[PDB]
Write a protein that binds this ligand. Sequence first.
Ligand SMILES: *[C@@H]1O[C@H](CO)[C@@H](O[C@@H]2O[C@H](CO)[C@@H](O)[C@H](O)[C@H]2NC(C)=O)[C@H](O)[C@H]1NC(C)=O
Ligand SMILES: *[C@@H]1O[C@H](CO)[C@@H](O[C@@H]2O[C@H](CO)[C@@H](O)[C@H](O)[C@H]2NC(C)=O)[C@H](O)[C@H]1NC(C)=O
Ligand SMILES: *[C@@H]1O[C@H](CO)[C@@H](O[C@@H]2O[C@H](CO)[C@@H](O)[C@H](O)[C@H]2NC(C)=O)[C@H](O)[C@H]1NC(C)=O
Ligand SMILES: *[C@@H]1O[C@H](CO)[C@@H](O[C@@H]2O[C@H](CO)[C@@H](O)[C@H](O)[C@H]2NC(C)=O)[C@H](O)[C@H]1NC(C)=O
Ligand SMILES: *[C@@H]1O[C@H](CO)[C@@H](O[C@@H]2O[C@H](CO)[C@@H](O)[C@H](O)[C@H]2NC(C)=O)[C@H](O)[C@H]1NC(C)=O
Ligand SMILES: *[C@@H]1O[C@H](CO)[C@@H](O)[C@H](O)[C@H]1NC(C)=O
Ligand SMILES: *[C@@H]1O[C@H](CO)[C@@H](O)[C@H](O)[C@H]1NC(C)=O
Ligand SMILES: *[C@@H]1O[C@H](CO)[C@@H](O)[C@H](O)[C@H]1NC(C)=O
Ligand SMILES: *[C@@H]1O[C@H](CO)[C@@H](O)[C@H](O)[C@H]1NC(C)=O
Lengths: 329, 232, 82
Amino acid sequence: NFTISVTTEILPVSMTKTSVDCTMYICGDSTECSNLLLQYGSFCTQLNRALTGIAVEQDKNTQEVFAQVKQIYKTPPIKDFGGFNFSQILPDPSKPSKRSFIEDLLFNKVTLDLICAQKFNGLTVLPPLLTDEMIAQYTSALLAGTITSGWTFGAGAALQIPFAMQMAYRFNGIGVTQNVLYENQKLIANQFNSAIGKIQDSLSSTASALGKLQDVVNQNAQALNTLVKQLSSNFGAISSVLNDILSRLDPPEAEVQIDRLITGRLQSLQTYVTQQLIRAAEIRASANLAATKMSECVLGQSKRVDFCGKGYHLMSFPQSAPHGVVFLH
Amino acid sequence: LYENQKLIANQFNSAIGKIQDSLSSTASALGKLQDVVNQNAQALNTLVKQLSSNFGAISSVLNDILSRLDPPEAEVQIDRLITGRLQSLQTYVTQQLIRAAEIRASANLAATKMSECVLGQSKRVDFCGKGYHLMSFPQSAPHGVVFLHVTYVPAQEKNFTTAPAICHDGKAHFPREGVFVSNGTHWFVTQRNFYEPQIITTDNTFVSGNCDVVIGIVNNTVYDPLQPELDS
Amino acid sequence: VLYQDVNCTEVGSNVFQTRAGCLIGAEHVNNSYECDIPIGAGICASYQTQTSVASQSIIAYTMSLGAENSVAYSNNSIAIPT
Ligand SMILES: *[C@@H]1O[C@H](CO)[C@@H](O[C@@H]2O[C@H](CO)[C@@H](O)[C@H](O)[C@H]2NC(C)=O)[C@H](O)[C@H]1NC(C)=O
Ligand SMILES: *[C@@H]1O[C@H](CO)[C@@H](O[C@@H]2O[C@H](CO)[C@@H](O)[C@H](O)[C@H]2NC(C)=O)[C@H](O)[C@H]1NC(C)=O
Ligand SMILES: *[C@@H]1O[C@H](CO)[C@@H](O[C@@H]2O[C@H](CO)[C@@H](O)[C@H](O)[C@H]2NC(C)=O)[C@H](O)[C@H]1NC(C)=O
Ligand SMILES: *[C@@H]1O[C@H](CO)[C@@H](O[C@@H]2O[C@H](CO)[C@@H](O)[C@H](O)[C@H]2NC(C)=O)[C@H](O)[C@H]1NC(C)=O
Ligand SMILES: *[C@@H]1O[C@H](CO)[C@@H](O[C@@H]2O[C@H](CO)[C@@H](O)[C@H](O)[C@H]2NC(C)=O)[C@H](O)[C@H]1NC(C)=O
Ligand SMILES: *[C@@H]1O[C@H](CO)[C@@H](O)[C@H](O)[C@H]1NC(C)=O
Ligand SMILES: *[C@@H]1O[C@H](CO)[C@@H](O)[C@H](O)[C@H]1NC(C)=O
Ligand SMILES: *[C@@H]1O[C@H](CO)[C@@H](O)[C@H](O)[C@H]1NC(C)=O
Ligand SMILES: *[C@@H]1O[C@H](CO)[C@@H](O)[C@H](O)[C@H]1NC(C)=O
């Protein structure tokens, strides 16, 4: 006898497209500080180029993980999938955004003024090119291609095929002859529905399941928070704000204090940029892993052992998430 | 293949011609190499321009500081200049290290692509290009490598009325390799990817139990390939 | 000019409020095209050379995901390539 066990698998795909401006952060909107900063040279161009490259790479990660389908498929109005119940993962038109029951359980356990403080210092956050709506529509198209068209919708044109006949391919691909499916179809449908219910219950228990996304957001948030607090550092100067240095000293003696403050702040911002670049490279590796997982588990059936979840993998259902993607193997 | 060999050869030649034409149109196809070279060139260029920075000192070249001040007072200016230049060079080195790690990941991807796509035939879906993969042809490039993934793409479709199995005299009949399809009246057993219809003998099909348990089964008389042989 | 994170109260009919920000200098197109310049929150501006009116113009349309498909799944219908 056999059992089918849906396993969730979370993968970060992108982080927040942050952006930092020198004259807002390095200078407290002053003029002499701007003169000294332009005297230092072209560090700011390098910083802006690095951060824009980070943002571009995140946009490419998001657009490469999900947008692997040329056409947006739709599920048929009828749901005669051979007893298989997909109401939990299929889109729910009740919401204005075409999300699903399981996708909704994900957008509530992350949750992504401090933001105003970051904004006033030049630490802005750009919005992603793909909103949750279009990402959800990409996931819905992937679901429709997987359920209705099997896996040929990734190779070329989508070809309609019965779901009770599609799974007759996958068992025959994992060794078990399709007669086992065609004699135990009702039992398999019951086990699949029970597994979906169990994974929904597990997702509705604690947020610790999504321990990866709650880290890809909490690390960037903490990095921005600790970058903000570097403005409250003396750095050797007799103060920490440049409006209380030019209001006390004269240019020839205030330039050394401002030079100390600016080299300290530039060092802190360069450290932040380097950490952001390293984290973006790690997220790029994770997004490549997610892209190949969605290209193999979803768009087909991987023979790789313990890749698409432990056990002989049958199929996968990609689902959106806050700055990531979760697979239901 | 053995029935459509000339057609496949013509299609392959046409595809090679088309990819040659596409390569002879714009450099935007090679948008990755033109970045792995341009980013390094721009990094070197912006490292050069950091020598033209005062960094707080009263000049920007070390020959116009030791020609103005004396050692005990020129050392502070030189320390300013050297810490600034060392910071800039360390930034360049860190950027180069990060980019080298990214290029190392890309080269590992290229190595596994050459080891699987070229040196064999990968069953991984959409790894060696969209569609089923036949073979790949590596080609050199400036600081990179380009693959020419030959792919198998199904062109034209045709609906059929399928069936999970076939009742003959109460015993189920499942196809061992392929699916059961019907062009309206008769039935055939065909391979999945290509529409090659064949009659339902006892070789293309295997029995498993009765046929009242499977859902969606249809009726047909499976042509036993021994009836004319056993009649005589 | 795209003013990000601005209430657009301070810096007619050239504006278009996007979730990223109000894009001053671009006219919206209610049709959706495949977009080449990414802007933010699903908006993409592009250069449109039209021989009728405004041969030099920039249009900021909502991003188009692709051609919507309606594959007809049936419990007894299969599609096998020929
Ligand atoms: C294979 O395992 C499944 C799941 O345990 C079995 O289904 C259960 O069968 C028992 C009685 O045999 C029922 O009381 C349960 O309600 C069934 N559970 C479900 C979820 O359907 C199935 O019978 C087993 N098959 C064999 C041949 O032993
Ligand atoms: C598919 O599963 C969903 C949820 O597991 C079913 O929806 C439930 O339906 C029952 C009976 O109509 C209600 O009492 C519950 O409140 C519903 N729950 C939810 C979350 O909607 C649905 O009926 C199932 N459909 C099929 C065809 O099996
Ligand atoms: C399968 O498709 C190929 C490519 O479209 C067809 O080959 C062409 O066929 C037409 C008409 O038969 C010829 O005029 C062309 O010269 C062919 N091109 C090449 C490159 O061979 C082929 O005929 C199709 N086969 C079937 C059975 O429809
Ligand atoms: C389905 O395919 C079968 C193939 O055997 C068709 O049967 C023959 O089709 C040819 C077409 O040239 C006719 O000349 C023959 O008279 C048909 N019968 C036999 C016994 O060979 C059949 O017509 C096709 N269509 C349907 C609706 O069954
Ligand atoms: C398929 O063919 C069989 C044999 O010709 C039909 O036989 C039926 O078998 C069931 C099971 O014992 C009986 O309850 C029915 O009374 C039989 N039919 C008749 C007319 O006696 C069967 O009906 C056919 N099924 C389909 C779907 O075509
Ligand atoms: C399954 O196919 C049969 C044959 O056309 C059809 O009568 C039936 O309505 C289909 N099932 C559903 C749930 O529509
Ligand atoms: C198959 O059926 C669908 C819906 O009935 C139709 O849109 C499509 O054109 C058909 N394809 C062929 C090849 O007949
Ligand atoms: C816009 O309004 C908000 C709320 O009052 C305020 O925080 C912000 O500073 C204003 N200005 C912007 C975003 O340019
Ligand atoms: C905008 O919508 C109107 C109707 O609401 C339509 O006539 C027009 O073509 C659309 N596109 C524009 C104005 O670019």
